[PDB]
Amino acid sequence: INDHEYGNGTCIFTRDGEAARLFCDEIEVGMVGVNVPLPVPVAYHSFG
Amino acid sequence: GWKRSLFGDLHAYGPDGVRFYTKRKAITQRWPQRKSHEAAQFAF
Amino acid sequence: MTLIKHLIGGELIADTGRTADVFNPSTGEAVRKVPLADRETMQQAIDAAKAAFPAWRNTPPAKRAQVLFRFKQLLEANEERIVKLISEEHGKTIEDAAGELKRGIENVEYATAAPEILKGEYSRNVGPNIDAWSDFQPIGVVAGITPFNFPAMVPLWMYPLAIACGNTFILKPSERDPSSTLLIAELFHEAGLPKGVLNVVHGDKGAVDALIEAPEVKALSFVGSTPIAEYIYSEGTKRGKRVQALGGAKNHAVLMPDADLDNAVSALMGAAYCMAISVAVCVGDQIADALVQKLVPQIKGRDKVTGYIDTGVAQGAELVVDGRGGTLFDRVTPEMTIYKEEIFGPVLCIVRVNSLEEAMQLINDHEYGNGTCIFTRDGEAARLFCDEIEVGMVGVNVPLPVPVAYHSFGGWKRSLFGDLHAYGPDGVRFYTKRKAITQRWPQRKSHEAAQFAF
Amino acid sequence: MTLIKHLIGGELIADTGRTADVFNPSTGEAVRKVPLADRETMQQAIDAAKAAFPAWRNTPPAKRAQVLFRFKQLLEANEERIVKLISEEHGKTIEDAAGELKRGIENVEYATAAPEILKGEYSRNVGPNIDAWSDFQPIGVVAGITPFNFPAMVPLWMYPLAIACGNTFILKPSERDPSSTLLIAELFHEAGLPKGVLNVVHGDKGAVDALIEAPEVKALSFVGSTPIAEYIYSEGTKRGKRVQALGGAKNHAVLMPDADLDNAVSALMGAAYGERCMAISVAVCVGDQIADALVQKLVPQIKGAARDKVTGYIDTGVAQGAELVVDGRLGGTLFDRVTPEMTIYKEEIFGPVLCIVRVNSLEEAMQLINDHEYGNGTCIFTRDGEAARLFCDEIEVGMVGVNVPLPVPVAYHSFGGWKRSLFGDLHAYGPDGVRFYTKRKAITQRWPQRKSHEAAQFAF
Amino acid sequence: AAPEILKGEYSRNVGPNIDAWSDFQPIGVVAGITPFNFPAMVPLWMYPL
Numbered sequence A: 001i002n003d004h005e006y007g008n009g010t011c012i013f014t015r016d017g018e019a020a021r022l023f024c025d026e027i028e029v030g031m032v033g034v035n036v037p038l039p040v041p042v043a044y045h046s047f048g
Numbered sequence B: 001g002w003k004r005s006l007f008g009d010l011h012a013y014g015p016d017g018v019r020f021y022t023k024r025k026a027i028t029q030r031w032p033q034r035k036s037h038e039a040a041q042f043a044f
Numbered sequence C: 001m002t003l004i005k006h007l008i009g010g011e012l013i014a015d016t017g018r019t020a021d022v023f024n025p026s027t028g029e030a031v032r033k034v035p036l037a038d039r040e041t042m043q044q045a046i047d048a049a050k051a052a053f054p055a056w057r058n059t060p061p062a063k064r065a066q067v068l069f070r071f072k073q074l075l076e077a078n079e080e081r082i083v084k085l086i087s088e089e090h091g092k093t094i095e096d097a098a099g100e101l102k103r104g105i106e107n108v109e110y111a112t113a114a115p116e117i118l119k120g121e122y123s124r125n126v127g128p129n130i131d132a133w134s135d136f137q138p139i140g141v142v143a144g145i146t147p148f149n150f151p152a153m154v155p156l157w158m159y160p161l162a163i164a165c166g167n168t169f170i171l172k173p174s175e176r177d178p179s180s181t182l183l184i185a186e187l188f189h190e191a192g193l194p195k196g197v198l199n200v201v202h203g204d205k206g207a208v209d210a211l212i213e214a215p216e217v218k219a220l221s222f223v224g225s226t227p228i229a230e231y232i233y234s235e236g237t238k239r240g241k242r243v244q245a246l247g248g249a250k251n252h253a254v255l256m257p258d259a260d261l262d263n264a265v266s267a268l269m270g271a272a273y274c275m276a277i278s279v280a281v282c283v284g285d286q287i288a289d290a291l292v293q294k295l296v297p298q299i300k301g302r303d304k305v306t307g308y309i310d311t312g313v314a315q316g317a318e319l320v321v322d323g324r325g326g327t328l329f330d331r332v333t334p335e336m337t338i339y340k341e342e343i344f345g346p347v348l349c350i351v352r353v354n355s356l357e358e359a360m361q362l363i364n365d366h367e368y369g370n371g372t373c374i375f376t377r378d379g380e381a382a383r384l385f386c387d388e389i390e391v392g393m394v395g396v397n398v399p400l401p402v403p404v405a406y407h408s409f410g411g412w413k414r415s416l417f418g419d420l421h422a423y424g425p426d427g428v429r430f431y432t433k434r435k436a437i438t439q440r441w442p443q444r445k446s447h448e449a450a451q452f453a454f
Numbered sequence D: 001m002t003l004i005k006h007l008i009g010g011e012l013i014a015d016t017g018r019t020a021d022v023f024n025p026s027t028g029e030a031v032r033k034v035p036l037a038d039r040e041t042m043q044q045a046i047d048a049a050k051a052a053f054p055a056w057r058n059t060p061p062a063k064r065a066q067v068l069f070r071f072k073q074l075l076e077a078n079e080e081r082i083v084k085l086i087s088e089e090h091g092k093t094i095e096d097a098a099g100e101l102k103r104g105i106e107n108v109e110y111a112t113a114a115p116e117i118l119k120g121e122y123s124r125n126v127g128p129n130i131d132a133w134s135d136f137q138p139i140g141v142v143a144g145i146t147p148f149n150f151p152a153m154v155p156l157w158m159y160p161l162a163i164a165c166g167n168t169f170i171l172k173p174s175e176r177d178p179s180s181t182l183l184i185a186e187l188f189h190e191a192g193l194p195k196g197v198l199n200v201v202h203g204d205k206g207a208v209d210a211l212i213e214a215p216e217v218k219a220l221s222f223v224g225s226t227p228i229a230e231y232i233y234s235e236g237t238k239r240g241k242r243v244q245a246l247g248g249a250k251n252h253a254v255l256m257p258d259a260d261l262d263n264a265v266s267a268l269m270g271a272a273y274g275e276r277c278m279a280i281s282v283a284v285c286v287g288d289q290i291a292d293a294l295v296q297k298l299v300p301q302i303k304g305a306a307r308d309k310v311t312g313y314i315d316t317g318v319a320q321g322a323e324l325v326v327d328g329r330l331g332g333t334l335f336d337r338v339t340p341e342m343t344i345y346k347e348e349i350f351g352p353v354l355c356i357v358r359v360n361s362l363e364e365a366m367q368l369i370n371d372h373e374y375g376n377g378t379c380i381f382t383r384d385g386e387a388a389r390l391f392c393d394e395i396e397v398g399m400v401g402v403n404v405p406l407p408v409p410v411a412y413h414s415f416g417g418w419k420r421s422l423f424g425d426l427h428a429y430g431p432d433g434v435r436f437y438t439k440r441k442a443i444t445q446r447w448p449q450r451k452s453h454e455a456a457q458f459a460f
Numbered sequence E: 001a002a003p004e005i006l007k008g009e010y011s012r013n014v015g016p017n018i019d020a021w022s023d024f025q026p027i028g029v030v031a032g033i034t035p036f037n038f039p040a041m042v043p044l045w046m047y048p049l
Ligand SMILES: Nc1ncnc2c1ncn2[C@@H]1O[C@H](COP(=O)(O)OP(=O)(O)O)[C@@H](O)[C@H]1O
Pocket: C145, C146, C147, C148, C149, C172, C173, C174, C175, C203, C204, C205, C208, C209, C223, C224, C225, C226, C228, C231
């Protein structure tokens, strides 16, 4: 996810607390959803 | 667009530095429920 | 063998009558004698405090703050002297004893700022020629009964706050280490405290029964063992007194099947052989069998204890490691005596249970303590545990800074180890009464000398 | 004619078993029937509330505030209908009944803003990979037992706040006027409240004992008479429950020798003979002069089976040596020379009765008031500043009036450490309610790490 | 004093059983290339912050 022109929303689906914490820490997307979708109806990458 | 002043008042132009070295993150979280929490529902 | 004096009415009294000995636990050798006081010697203190109250109640907030601030300095001045006195009669690491006093001083620092949060409102003409105001007043003469562990901090957690609120105090400390407590009392008098505002009376069940009976004393504050706590709570409350009571209890850790065992074992090993934990509730047999497997190797480093262990075996618990320390019991149930009765020393009990609901119900349905942990990788489990458990402080895969387990009785509840700024208001409310005054001075038509008195 | 239904689990249940009658004085022609519920019918409610709790607990603060705000509107909409139902089964001026509901609505308005004062703090990495936070949580399922006077306001003083904090509620109101209470419950459901969050179960000592016994209910709240209050307090607390209890009592006025008599008489006449008042039943007079003078002024103005209770009360008074100055046989009754050893001082009586107690000092008057189950209001009448200051300092009653009566129309003593004021400023005594219906928690959290996160480390 | 202005908000149950929060995180590994004039101040203007 991080190595491409990353978008404006991402989710992780899991029951593990440690996984979720790590995902939220190291992912570079600005909005993150843990077992929940986000109100971001179109994907965009931001330049500059 | 990542602009910093070198000689301005630090308290005035410091936030620009802070914004250059940080990223905002916005988390929404839910732990979806189970009906029961007997030992059979966890691992080894 | 010198003799330790009472501190009634501002001066040191020597009592000779009933009398026990203070030993030096690491030297096994009796060092001093302590006077078990009669009802007359207590009535002295009560009368002294009753007398000091009206003056002290009307002392300005800022002056009360002032005397407390100097009290804090004079403690930070005499630390070395104090700590020596704790380690000598209680027997504890000087580093621990100094850490205790640092906490006591945090309690004194909090009390210095209590006058500020106690200011109330005034309103001229809330109605026609009717003023209204609201105030927080002290309740009167109050007493505190303190335990063996913590002769420095537990009193400093009671009386400075109560005195800052404008009450007067009778302190009946532990017979077994009363010298360190009394020194700190004296330093308070040296800081400027009026005579009678703090009194120290040494004694035992007699002394305590005296305070429970005395109708002048309005509130009673106790930390110690659960039978004595229940006593003072019920018998105090039945006589119209306010009672705050912390009685010894058992903190529980919960292990889910997914628990990181080395993490749980680290907490349990630090806590049982830091935090106080005496029961490990395991959900499912797998995690329990596994926990035992790891605990046994590492558990290799009074007549009360043999009786305790023996009863356990008798009622069907599995004695896995016999420390006769370092004792481990498995297959323990809440109907056993080893679960119900609290024991001094390194003893851990494993209780096997089938669901998280059962574990939480187990912890909630008994005299629940002041700390609890859950060990798990599951976010949903942890959230649920934190929501439905009734213990005030919770640790998720981490132990808590709660070194002794206590249950709190009644409605006048105070936390001993919480953040002072968070649980301080509960103390303030215990030592004060709220008042709402509405006032009018009904008018006369004329104010000639004939309308007044000679 | 009609029969009143329970409101368990969001639907109206019809119970047929034991049953009493709701009467309507001044007619005393019985108008409806009420179902005295068994333990089974209560366990229904308990299970309903226990079920509703987890969903409700996790409902957002703003959504809870929202449903309360509509509840306030639907009450201000149906006022006429409600007040009618109060005056009909309790028997009181519609103007009083409407003033009661106005108070109940103030309680609902306060509850709508409780979610705001309830948010807590968060700290990421308070230690290495250790988060910490503090929360104010609801306690679970709670119950409230309500009296005959105020079938509208006393419940609205309990459950809206408890529900706003995120608990669920079982309400066991008075058998004698339960229709008005139930209507207001239904309006709450109509405003949007989930099923099971509020339940109404009619009954009596059986029903109450059920709630005292049920280990699921975590807090118990009561307003009524002193014997029943002591009961619920002690028996509740002994079973680990939180108990809030207001029991009927007597408010005292003190008259100093210098008191402005017309001012004191005005207060006493409004309080004892004249729900839109103060409640005062005892006038403690310091010195005989002011007492003789007070009696002189009071007597003229007091001319403006079930009966057997009052005659018994008065007759005992005479028997034990009190001076019966005005015999109201019910009209205004006045007793003089009353002492705390008499039955007329110890036992509370329905009706317009004032007792004068003569005492020699202010200290004695204060000790008299403080040494009994002291009420929720007291007055001192005097011109002396020092007396008034001392009275305000040493009296233990929470609200005090100096030459002025207080807006405290019924006298109650408060038991235990979970203390709530019924008639205080809501914004001032509301936090005590909030603290009774919540528990503080401090959480510290760490998710212990793995070295690698390959699929093999998770479950299917 | 930069840690102080960097604290974020937490909200329990922003939706049914849904918590929300916001944080200000560091970005990772960063580099600074400094000039001849000011070998003291220009680096201290970059890396400490
Ligand atoms: N039987 C009793 N009744 C009332 N008070 C007691 C009784 N025994 C001890 N105390 C007082 O209670 C305090 C501590 O209670 P206790 O449970 O004995 O704790 P400890 O573990 O320090 O002995 C002591 O200060 C002691 O004087």
